[PDB]
Design a protein around this ligand. Structure first.
Ligand SMILES: Cc1cc(C(=O)O)ccc1CN1CCC[C@H](O[C@H](CO)c2cc(Cl)cc(Cl)c2)[C@@H]1c1ccccc1
Ligand SMILES: [Cl-]
Length: 467
Protein backbone atom coordinates (compact mmCIF):
# COMPACT_ATOMS: atom_id res chain seq x y z
CA UNK A 1 0.00 0.00 0.00
CA UNK A 2 2.73 2.47 1.14
CA UNK A 3 5.58 0.39 -0.50
CA UNK A 4 3.25 -0.51 -3.49
CA UNK A 5 3.33 3.26 -4.26
CA UNK A 6 7.19 3.21 -4.49
CA UNK A 7 7.21 0.53 -7.31
CA UNK A 8 4.25 2.03 -9.22
CA UNK A 9 6.28 5.29 -9.17
CA UNK A 10 9.57 3.69 -10.40
CA UNK A 11 7.55 1.79 -13.11
CA UNK A 12 5.89 5.01 -14.47
CA UNK A 13 9.39 6.57 -14.72
CA UNK A 14 10.40 3.62 -17.01
CA UNK A 15 7.48 4.30 -19.49
CA UNK A 16 8.77 6.90 -22.07
CA UNK A 17 5.37 8.68 -22.44
CA UNK A 18 4.92 9.31 -18.66
CA UNK A 19 8.54 9.43 -17.29
CA UNK A 20 8.95 13.08 -18.40
CA UNK A 21 5.80 14.21 -16.44
CA UNK A 22 5.99 16.10 -13.11
CA UNK A 23 6.11 14.02 -9.90
CA UNK A 24 2.87 15.64 -8.65
CA UNK A 25 1.03 13.93 -11.59
CA UNK A 26 3.01 10.62 -11.12
CA UNK A 27 2.47 10.26 -7.31
CA UNK A 28 -1.22 11.25 -7.66
CA UNK A 29 -1.41 8.56 -10.47
CA UNK A 30 0.29 5.86 -8.26
CA UNK A 31 -2.42 6.43 -5.52
CA UNK A 32 -5.42 5.80 -7.83
CA UNK A 33 -4.02 3.02 -10.15
CA UNK A 34 -5.58 -0.45 -9.53
CA UNK A 35 -3.63 -3.57 -10.51
CA UNK A 36 -5.79 -6.15 -12.51
CA UNK A 37 -4.58 -9.72 -13.45
CA UNK A 38 -5.30 -11.82 -16.63
CA UNK A 39 -4.53 -15.35 -17.86
CA UNK A 40 -3.27 -16.45 -21.33
CA UNK A 41 -6.12 -16.32 -23.85
CA UNK A 42 -8.29 -14.00 -21.68
CA UNK A 43 -9.96 -11.06 -23.46
CA UNK A 44 -8.96 -7.90 -21.50
CA UNK A 45 -11.19 -5.97 -23.96
CA UNK A 46 -13.74 -7.11 -26.63
CA UNK A 47 -14.59 -5.15 -29.80
CA UNK A 48 -18.15 -3.61 -29.76
CA UNK A 49 -18.34 -3.44 -25.92
CA UNK A 50 -18.69 -0.11 -24.06
CA UNK A 51 -16.05 0.71 -21.40
CA UNK A 52 -14.63 3.56 -19.29
CA UNK A 53 -11.17 2.11 -18.31
CA UNK A 54 -7.51 2.74 -19.58
CA UNK A 55 -4.72 0.07 -19.28
CA UNK A 56 -0.92 0.08 -18.92
CA UNK A 57 0.97 -3.26 -19.13
CA UNK A 58 3.25 -3.94 -16.11
CA UNK A 59 3.97 -7.63 -16.92
CA UNK A 60 3.25 -9.76 -20.05
CA UNK A 61 2.08 -9.22 -23.67
CA UNK A 62 -1.28 -8.75 -25.42
CA UNK A 63 -2.40 -9.29 -29.10
CA UNK A 64 -4.77 -6.74 -30.67
CA UNK A 65 -7.20 -8.05 -33.41
CA UNK A 66 -10.20 -6.38 -35.21
CA UNK A 67 -12.98 -8.33 -37.09
CA UNK A 68 -14.40 -6.09 -39.89
CA UNK A 69 -17.60 -8.17 -40.43
CA UNK A 70 -19.58 -10.99 -38.74
CA UNK A 71 -18.73 -13.45 -41.59
CA UNK A 72 -15.00 -12.55 -42.01
CA UNK A 73 -11.84 -13.80 -40.18
CA UNK A 74 -10.21 -11.50 -37.54
CA UNK A 75 -7.44 -9.06 -38.55
CA UNK A 76 -4.29 -9.11 -36.36
CA UNK A 77 -2.96 -5.53 -35.82
CA UNK A 78 -0.22 -5.51 -33.13
CA UNK A 79 1.41 -7.04 -30.03
CA UNK A 80 1.84 -4.76 -26.94
CA UNK A 81 4.24 -5.55 -24.09
CA UNK A 82 5.34 -4.01 -20.79
CA UNK A 83 5.23 -0.18 -20.88
CA UNK A 84 2.63 -0.06 -23.70
CA UNK A 85 -0.94 1.06 -23.09
CA UNK A 86 -4.40 0.81 -24.64
CA UNK A 87 -8.12 1.68 -24.20
CA UNK A 88 -7.31 5.49 -23.96
CA UNK A 89 -10.35 6.56 -26.09
CA UNK A 90 -12.51 5.43 -23.05
CA UNK A 91 -11.01 8.25 -20.88
CA UNK A 92 -11.80 11.13 -23.33
CA UNK A 93 -15.54 10.34 -23.54
CA UNK A 94 -16.23 7.71 -26.34
CA UNK A 95 -16.81 4.35 -24.61
CA UNK A 96 -17.39 2.03 -27.64
CA UNK A 97 -14.47 -0.44 -28.27
CA UNK A 98 -13.14 -1.00 -31.86
CA UNK A 99 -10.63 -3.93 -31.34
CA UNK A 100 -10.14 -6.96 -29.04
CA UNK A 101 -7.10 -6.99 -26.64
CA UNK A 102 -6.34 -10.63 -25.72
CA UNK A 103 -3.76 -11.82 -23.17
CA UNK A 104 -0.94 -13.61 -25.10
CA UNK A 105 0.44 -14.99 -21.73
CA UNK A 106 0.01 -14.18 -17.96
CA UNK A 107 -0.72 -10.40 -18.07
CA UNK A 108 -0.79 -7.67 -15.37
CA UNK A 109 -2.23 -4.21 -16.07
CA UNK A 110 -2.52 -1.04 -14.00
CA UNK A 111 -6.01 0.26 -14.75
CA UNK A 112 -7.80 3.59 -14.23
CA UNK A 113 -11.44 4.49 -15.09
CA UNK A 114 -12.72 7.77 -16.69
CA UNK A 115 -14.08 9.42 -13.45
CA UNK A 116 -10.93 8.55 -11.43
CA UNK A 117 -8.86 10.26 -14.21
CA UNK A 118 -11.07 13.39 -14.59
CA UNK A 119 -11.18 13.81 -10.79
CA UNK A 120 -7.37 13.41 -10.72
CA UNK A 121 -6.76 16.24 -13.28
CA UNK A 122 -7.60 18.82 -10.44
CA UNK A 123 -4.02 19.97 -9.60
CA UNK A 124 -1.27 22.71 -9.44
CA UNK A 125 -2.61 25.49 -11.78
CA UNK A 126 0.17 26.88 -14.19
CA UNK A 127 2.79 24.45 -12.77
CA UNK A 128 1.32 20.95 -13.39
CA UNK A 129 -1.93 21.62 -15.36
CA UNK A 130 0.19 23.73 -17.84
CA UNK A 131 2.74 20.90 -18.22
CA UNK A 132 -0.08 18.34 -18.73
CA UNK A 133 -1.62 20.23 -21.69
CA UNK A 134 1.83 20.71 -23.38
CA UNK A 135 2.35 16.91 -23.62
CA UNK A 136 -1.33 16.40 -24.66
CA UNK A 137 -0.85 19.05 -27.42
CA UNK A 138 2.47 17.39 -28.56
CA UNK A 139 0.69 14.01 -28.43
CA UNK A 140 -2.29 15.43 -30.44
CA UNK A 141 0.11 16.21 -33.40
CA UNK A 142 1.48 12.54 -33.58
CA UNK A 143 -2.15 11.33 -33.67
CA UNK A 144 -2.80 13.79 -36.58
CA UNK A 145 0.25 12.48 -38.57
CA UNK A 146 -0.90 8.83 -38.37
CA UNK A 147 -4.41 9.78 -39.62
CA UNK A 148 -2.79 11.37 -42.75
CA UNK A 149 -0.10 8.61 -43.02
CA UNK A 150 -2.83 6.01 -43.86
CA UNK A 151 -4.00 8.20 -46.79
CA UNK A 152 -3.08 7.91 -50.51
CA UNK A 153 -3.60 10.41 -53.38
CA UNK A 154 -6.32 8.01 -54.68
CA UNK A 155 -8.33 8.96 -51.46
CA UNK A 156 -8.78 12.56 -52.86
CA UNK A 157 -10.58 14.10 -55.81
CA UNK A 158 -9.82 17.49 -57.50
CA UNK A 159 -12.30 20.36 -57.30
CA UNK A 160 -10.65 23.45 -58.93
CA UNK A 161 -7.27 25.12 -59.50
CA UNK A 162 -6.16 27.75 -56.92
CA UNK A 163 -2.84 28.86 -58.52
CA UNK A 164 -0.68 28.03 -61.50
CA UNK A 165 3.01 28.90 -62.08
CA UNK A 166 6.25 27.43 -63.45
CA UNK A 167 6.44 25.27 -60.24
CA UNK A 168 3.23 23.43 -61.16
CA UNK A 169 -0.06 24.30 -59.57
CA UNK A 170 -2.20 24.42 -56.41
CA UNK A 171 -5.48 22.53 -56.52
CA UNK A 172 -8.43 22.43 -54.15
CA UNK A 173 -8.86 18.69 -53.29
CA UNK A 174 -11.72 16.97 -51.45
CA UNK A 175 -11.24 13.91 -49.19
CA UNK A 176 -13.48 11.35 -50.96
CA UNK A 177 -14.40 9.65 -47.64
CA UNK A 178 -15.53 12.91 -45.87
CA UNK A 179 -16.70 15.59 -48.35
CA UNK A 180 -16.63 18.42 -45.66
CA UNK A 181 -12.78 17.91 -45.65
CA UNK A 182 -11.08 20.02 -48.39
CA UNK A 183 -7.34 20.85 -48.77
CA UNK A 184 -5.05 22.97 -50.95
CA UNK A 185 -2.83 20.41 -52.75
CA UNK A 186 0.37 21.95 -54.15
CA UNK A 187 1.56 19.64 -57.00
CA UNK A 188 5.22 20.41 -58.00
CA UNK A 189 7.20 19.32 -61.10
CA UNK A 190 10.38 17.56 -59.80
CA UNK A 191 12.20 18.67 -62.94
CA UNK A 192 11.69 22.38 -62.08
CA UNK A 193 12.96 21.84 -58.49
CA UNK A 194 16.02 20.06 -59.96
CA UNK A 195 16.65 22.65 -62.72
CA UNK A 196 16.55 25.50 -60.11
CA UNK A 197 18.75 23.62 -57.50
CA UNK A 198 15.84 23.73 -54.95
CA UNK A 199 16.09 20.13 -53.59
CA UNK A 200 17.15 21.44 -50.18
CA UNK A 201 14.80 24.52 -50.17
CA UNK A 202 11.91 22.06 -50.69
CA UNK A 203 13.23 19.55 -48.09
CA UNK A 204 13.37 22.38 -45.47
CA UNK A 205 9.93 23.75 -46.56
CA UNK A 206 8.43 20.34 -45.70
CA UNK A 207 10.31 20.02 -42.34
CA UNK A 208 9.31 23.58 -41.20
CA UNK A 209 5.59 23.74 -42.27
CA UNK A 210 4.92 20.25 -40.75
CA UNK A 211 6.75 21.37 -37.55
CA UNK A 212 4.85 24.70 -37.38
CA UNK A 213 1.59 24.93 -35.36
CA UNK A 214 0.45 28.62 -35.62
CA UNK A 215 -2.90 30.14 -36.68
CA UNK A 216 -0.90 32.76 -38.70
CA UNK A 217 0.85 30.02 -40.77
CA UNK A 218 -0.73 27.56 -43.26
CA UNK A 219 -0.70 23.91 -41.99
CA UNK A 220 1.25 21.31 -44.06
CA UNK A 221 -0.32 18.01 -42.92
CA UNK A 222 1.77 15.62 -45.02
CA UNK A 223 3.44 15.05 -48.39
CA UNK A 224 3.12 12.61 -51.30
CA UNK A 225 5.30 11.78 -54.35
CA UNK A 226 5.24 9.95 -57.69
CA UNK A 227 7.87 9.63 -60.44
CA UNK A 228 7.26 13.23 -61.69
CA UNK A 229 5.77 15.35 -58.87
CA UNK A 230 5.77 16.21 -55.16
CA UNK A 231 2.35 16.80 -53.53
CA UNK A 232 1.97 19.01 -50.44
CA UNK A 233 -1.38 18.58 -48.61
CA UNK A 234 -2.18 21.91 -46.90
CA UNK A 235 -5.08 23.60 -45.14
CA UNK A 236 -7.54 25.28 -47.54
CA UNK A 237 -7.51 29.08 -46.92
CA UNK A 238 -10.46 30.01 -49.18
CA UNK A 239 -10.48 33.79 -48.42
CA UNK A 240 -8.53 34.45 -51.61
CA UNK A 241 -4.93 35.49 -52.45
CA UNK A 242 -3.70 38.76 -50.78
CA UNK A 243 -1.89 39.82 -54.01
CA UNK A 244 -5.14 39.42 -56.10
CA UNK A 245 -7.01 41.54 -53.52
CA UNK A 246 -4.31 44.27 -53.56
CA UNK A 247 -4.27 44.09 -57.38
CA UNK A 248 -8.05 44.69 -57.56
CA UNK A 249 -7.99 47.44 -54.87
CA UNK A 250 -4.68 49.23 -55.70
CA UNK A 251 -3.86 50.14 -52.10
CA UNK A 252 -5.18 49.24 -48.61
CA UNK A 253 -6.74 51.62 -46.03
CA UNK A 254 -4.49 52.38 -42.97
CA UNK A 255 -6.49 50.16 -40.55
CA UNK A 256 -6.70 47.26 -43.14
CA UNK A 257 -2.85 47.13 -43.41
CA UNK A 258 -2.63 47.23 -39.58
CA UNK A 259 -4.62 43.97 -39.42
CA UNK A 260 -2.52 42.13 -42.06
CA UNK A 261 0.77 43.51 -40.58
CA UNK A 262 -0.40 42.27 -37.18
CA UNK A 263 -1.02 38.75 -38.62
CA UNK A 264 2.53 38.73 -40.00
CA UNK A 265 3.89 40.10 -36.67
CA UNK A 266 2.39 37.05 -34.88
CA UNK A 267 3.74 34.64 -37.53
CA UNK A 268 7.17 36.23 -37.00
CA UNK A 269 6.80 36.04 -33.16
CA UNK A 270 6.17 32.30 -33.53
CA UNK A 271 8.88 31.59 -36.17
CA UNK A 272 11.56 33.71 -34.44
CA UNK A 273 10.79 31.97 -31.06
CA UNK A 274 11.94 28.67 -32.71
CA UNK A 275 14.99 30.24 -34.45
CA UNK A 276 13.54 30.24 -37.97
CA UNK A 277 14.18 33.07 -40.49
CA UNK A 278 11.39 33.41 -43.16
CA UNK A 279 13.01 35.73 -45.80
CA UNK A 280 10.38 35.49 -48.63
CA UNK A 281 7.88 38.15 -47.31
CA UNK A 282 5.86 39.94 -50.06
CA UNK A 283 2.03 40.00 -50.70
CA UNK A 284 2.28 36.80 -52.79
CA UNK A 285 3.28 34.94 -49.52
CA UNK A 286 0.02 35.93 -47.64
CA UNK A 287 -3.38 34.17 -48.06
CA UNK A 288 -6.67 34.93 -46.27
CA UNK A 289 -8.85 32.12 -44.86
CA UNK A 290 -12.70 32.03 -45.06
CA UNK A 291 -12.91 34.39 -41.97
CA UNK A 292 -10.67 37.05 -43.64
CA UNK A 293 -7.56 36.31 -41.47
CA UNK A 294 -4.10 36.22 -43.23
CA UNK A 295 -1.61 33.23 -43.11
CA UNK A 296 2.04 32.81 -44.29
CA UNK A 297 2.29 30.24 -47.11
CA UNK A 298 5.54 29.20 -49.00
CA UNK A 299 8.55 28.35 -46.77
CA UNK A 300 11.01 28.07 -49.70
CA UNK A 301 13.55 30.61 -48.38
CA UNK A 302 12.77 29.88 -44.69
CA UNK A 303 15.79 28.61 -42.62
CA UNK A 304 16.51 27.11 -39.15
CA UNK A 305 19.33 29.20 -37.64
CA UNK A 306 21.45 28.47 -34.55
CA UNK A 307 21.14 30.73 -31.53
CA UNK A 308 23.95 33.25 -32.20
CA UNK A 309 24.45 32.26 -35.84
CA UNK A 310 23.85 34.15 -39.17
CA UNK A 311 23.42 33.07 -42.84
CA UNK A 312 25.15 34.16 -46.00
CA UNK A 313 22.89 32.86 -48.87
CA UNK A 314 22.03 35.67 -51.26
CA UNK A 315 18.38 35.08 -52.19
CA UNK A 316 14.94 36.72 -52.52
CA UNK A 317 13.09 39.08 -54.85
CA UNK A 318 15.32 42.22 -55.24
CA UNK A 319 12.60 44.67 -54.00
CA UNK A 320 12.39 42.86 -50.57
CA UNK A 321 16.11 41.95 -49.98
CA UNK A 322 17.72 43.63 -46.93
CA UNK A 323 21.06 45.57 -46.96
CA UNK A 324 22.98 42.86 -45.00
CA UNK A 325 21.85 40.24 -47.59
CA UNK A 326 23.03 42.42 -50.54
CA UNK A 327 26.28 43.39 -48.81
CA UNK A 328 26.87 39.66 -48.04
CA UNK A 329 27.60 40.35 -44.38
CA UNK A 330 25.67 37.99 -42.09
CA UNK A 331 21.86 37.97 -41.97
CA UNK A 332 19.57 36.65 -39.13
CA UNK A 333 15.90 36.90 -37.88
CA UNK A 334 16.16 40.76 -37.98
CA UNK A 335 16.19 40.56 -41.80
CA UNK A 336 12.44 39.71 -41.46
CA UNK A 337 11.79 43.05 -39.69
CA UNK A 338 13.16 44.84 -42.77
CA UNK A 339 10.51 42.86 -44.78
CA UNK A 340 7.62 44.18 -42.49
CA UNK A 341 8.46 47.79 -43.36
CA UNK A 342 8.54 46.91 -47.12
CA UNK A 343 5.18 45.00 -46.92
CA UNK A 344 3.63 47.92 -44.98
CA UNK A 345 4.83 50.51 -47.56
CA UNK A 346 3.53 48.37 -50.45
CA UNK A 347 0.12 47.58 -48.88
CA UNK A 348 -0.56 51.32 -48.22
CA UNK A 349 0.59 52.53 -51.72
CA UNK A 350 0.45 49.51 -54.10
CA UNK A 351 4.29 49.39 -54.73
CA UNK A 352 7.51 48.90 -52.63
CA UNK A 353 9.85 51.83 -51.81
CA UNK A 354 12.84 50.46 -53.78
CA UNK A 355 12.88 49.24 -57.44
CA UNK A 356 15.15 49.78 -60.48
CA UNK A 357 15.18 48.46 -64.10
CA UNK A 358 17.09 45.27 -63.08
CA UNK A 359 18.19 43.50 -59.81
CA UNK A 360 21.42 45.50 -59.64
CA UNK A 361 19.79 48.94 -59.84
CA UNK A 362 17.07 47.74 -57.35
CA UNK A 363 20.01 46.84 -54.98
CA UNK A 364 21.55 50.33 -55.48
CA UNK A 365 18.44 52.25 -54.20
CA UNK A 366 18.05 49.70 -51.28
CA UNK A 367 21.61 50.39 -50.00
CA UNK A 368 20.74 54.14 -50.15
CA UNK A 369 18.19 53.38 -47.43
CA UNK A 370 14.69 54.34 -46.25
CA UNK A 371 15.91 57.84 -45.17
CA UNK A 372 16.34 58.86 -48.86
CA UNK A 373 12.76 57.86 -49.76
CA UNK A 374 10.22 60.71 -50.10
CA UNK A 375 7.25 58.93 -48.45
CA UNK A 376 3.89 59.54 -50.27
CA UNK A 377 1.34 61.84 -48.65
CA UNK A 378 -1.01 58.74 -48.41
CA UNK A 379 1.31 57.20 -45.71
CA UNK A 380 0.26 58.36 -42.18
CA UNK A 381 2.87 59.87 -39.77
CA UNK A 382 2.60 56.82 -37.37
CA UNK A 383 2.84 54.31 -40.27
CA UNK A 384 5.88 56.15 -41.74
CA UNK A 385 7.46 56.28 -38.26
CA UNK A 386 7.27 52.46 -38.03
CA UNK A 387 8.53 51.83 -41.60
CA UNK A 388 11.59 54.08 -40.96
CA UNK A 389 12.32 52.16 -37.66
CA UNK A 390 11.77 48.72 -39.26
CA UNK A 391 13.90 49.47 -42.33
CA UNK A 392 17.07 50.80 -40.63
CA UNK A 393 20.43 49.87 -42.33
CA UNK A 394 22.22 48.37 -39.27
CA UNK A 395 20.22 45.19 -38.34
CA UNK A 396 21.25 45.65 -34.63
CA UNK A 397 19.36 49.02 -34.41
CA UNK A 398 16.21 47.63 -36.17
CA UNK A 399 12.78 47.60 -34.28
CA UNK A 400 11.98 43.99 -33.34
CA UNK A 401 15.72 43.22 -32.74
CA UNK A 402 15.96 45.39 -29.55
CA UNK A 403 15.42 44.57 -25.81
CA UNK A 404 11.82 43.41 -25.84
CA UNK A 405 12.10 41.94 -29.34
CA UNK A 406 8.76 41.62 -31.19
CA UNK A 407 6.97 43.36 -28.28
CA UNK A 408 8.69 46.70 -29.21
CA UNK A 409 6.81 46.52 -32.64
CA UNK A 410 3.50 45.59 -30.86
CA UNK A 411 4.01 48.58 -28.52
CA UNK A 412 4.44 51.12 -31.46
CA UNK A 413 2.19 54.24 -31.60
CA UNK A 414 0.67 52.82 -34.91
CA UNK A 415 -0.82 49.85 -32.92
CA UNK A 416 -2.40 52.21 -30.28
CA UNK A 417 -5.95 50.84 -30.03
CA UNK A 418 -5.13 47.47 -31.68
CA UNK A 419 -6.57 44.42 -29.89
CA UNK A 420 -3.55 42.05 -30.01
CA UNK A 421 -5.35 39.50 -27.75
CA UNK A 422 -8.50 39.71 -29.92
CA UNK A 423 -6.36 38.69 -32.92
CA UNK A 424 -4.70 35.75 -31.03
CA UNK A 425 -8.09 34.70 -29.56
CA UNK A 426 -9.60 35.01 -33.12
CA UNK A 427 -12.37 37.40 -31.98
CA UNK A 428 -11.10 40.50 -33.86
CA UNK A 429 -13.31 41.44 -36.84
CA UNK A 430 -11.09 41.57 -40.02
CA UNK A 431 -11.09 44.51 -42.56
CA UNK A 432 -12.31 42.57 -45.67
CA UNK A 433 -14.79 39.71 -44.93
CA UNK A 434 -14.71 36.93 -47.62
CA UNK A 435 -17.93 35.31 -48.87
CA UNK A 436 -17.22 31.52 -48.70
CA UNK A 437 -20.44 29.48 -49.27
CA UNK A 438 -18.93 26.00 -48.60
CA UNK A 439 -15.55 24.14 -48.40
CA UNK A 440 -15.62 23.67 -52.27
CA UNK A 441 -16.27 27.43 -52.99
CA UNK A 442 -13.29 28.82 -54.98
CA UNK A 443 -15.10 32.11 -55.94
CA UNK A 444 -12.39 34.40 -54.27
CA UNK A 445 -9.63 32.96 -56.60
CA UNK A 446 -8.99 33.56 -60.29
CA UNK A 447 -10.01 30.93 -62.87
CA UNK A 448 -7.09 29.07 -64.62
CA UNK A 449 -7.60 26.55 -67.48
CA UNK A 450 -6.55 22.88 -67.28
CA UNK A 451 -2.95 22.09 -68.38
CA UNK A 452 -2.89 20.69 -71.94
CA UNK A 453 0.89 20.15 -72.07
CA UNK A 454 2.60 16.81 -71.63
CA UNK A 455 3.86 15.78 -68.17
CA UNK A 456 7.51 16.44 -67.18
CA UNK A 457 10.20 13.70 -67.19
CA UNK A 458 10.35 11.03 -64.46
CA UNK A 459 13.05 11.53 -61.78
CA UNK A 460 13.96 8.56 -59.58
CA UNK A 461 17.30 9.97 -58.35
CA UNK A 462 16.31 9.47 -54.68
CA UNK A 463 16.48 13.02 -53.27
CA UNK A 464 12.66 12.79 -52.94
CA UNK A 465 13.13 9.78 -50.41
CA UNK A 466 11.72 11.85 -47.41
CA UNK A 467 8.46 12.88 -49.18
C1 LIG B 1 -2.62 10.31 -28.77
C2 LIG B 1 -3.42 11.38 -28.07
C3 LIG B 1 -4.50 11.96 -28.75
C4 LIG B 1 -5.23 13.01 -28.20
C5 LIG B 1 -6.45 13.55 -28.93
O1 LIG B 1 -6.46 13.49 -30.19
O2 LIG B 1 -7.38 14.03 -28.24
C6 LIG B 1 -4.86 13.52 -26.96
C7 LIG B 1 -3.81 12.95 -26.27
C8 LIG B 1 -3.09 11.87 -26.79
C9 LIG B 1 -1.99 11.30 -25.93
N1 LIG B 1 -2.49 10.33 -24.87
C10 LIG B 1 -2.86 9.01 -25.50
C11 LIG B 1 -3.40 8.03 -24.49
C12 LIG B 1 -2.43 7.84 -23.32
C13 LIG B 1 -2.14 9.19 -22.69
O3 LIG B 1 -3.36 9.88 -22.35
C14 LIG B 1 -4.17 9.36 -21.28
C15 LIG B 1 -5.47 10.17 -21.29
O4 LIG B 1 -5.28 11.54 -21.63
C16 LIG B 1 -3.51 9.49 -19.94
C17 LIG B 1 -3.62 8.45 -19.02
C18 LIG B 1 -2.92 8.51 -17.83
CL1 LIG B 1 -3.19 7.27 -16.63
C19 LIG B 1 -2.09 9.57 -17.52
C20 LIG B 1 -2.02 10.60 -18.43
CL2 LIG B 1 -1.10 12.02 -18.02
C21 LIG B 1 -2.71 10.58 -19.62
C22 LIG B 1 -1.51 10.12 -23.73
C23 LIG B 1 -1.03 11.36 -23.00
C24 LIG B 1 0.24 11.36 -22.44
C25 LIG B 1 0.69 12.44 -21.70
C26 LIG B 1 -0.12 13.53 -21.51
C27 LIG B 1 -1.39 13.55 -22.06
C28 LIG B 1 -1.84 12.47 -22.80
CL1 LIG C 1 -1.76 23.29 -34.79
Amino acid sequence: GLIKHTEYMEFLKSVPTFQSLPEEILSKLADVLEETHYENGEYIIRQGARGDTFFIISKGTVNVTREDSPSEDPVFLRTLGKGDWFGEKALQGEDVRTANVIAAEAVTCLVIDRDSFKHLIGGLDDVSNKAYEDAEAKAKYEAEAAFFANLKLSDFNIIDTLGVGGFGRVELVQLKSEESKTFAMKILKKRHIVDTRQQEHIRSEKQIMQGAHSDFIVRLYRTFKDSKYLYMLMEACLGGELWTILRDRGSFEDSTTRFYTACVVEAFAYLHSKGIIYRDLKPENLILDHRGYAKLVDFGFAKKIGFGKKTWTFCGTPEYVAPEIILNKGHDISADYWSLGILMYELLTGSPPFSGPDPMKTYNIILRGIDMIEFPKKIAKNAANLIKKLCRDNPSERLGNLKNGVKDIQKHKWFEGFNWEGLRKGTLTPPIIPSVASPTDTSNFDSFPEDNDEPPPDDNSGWDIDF
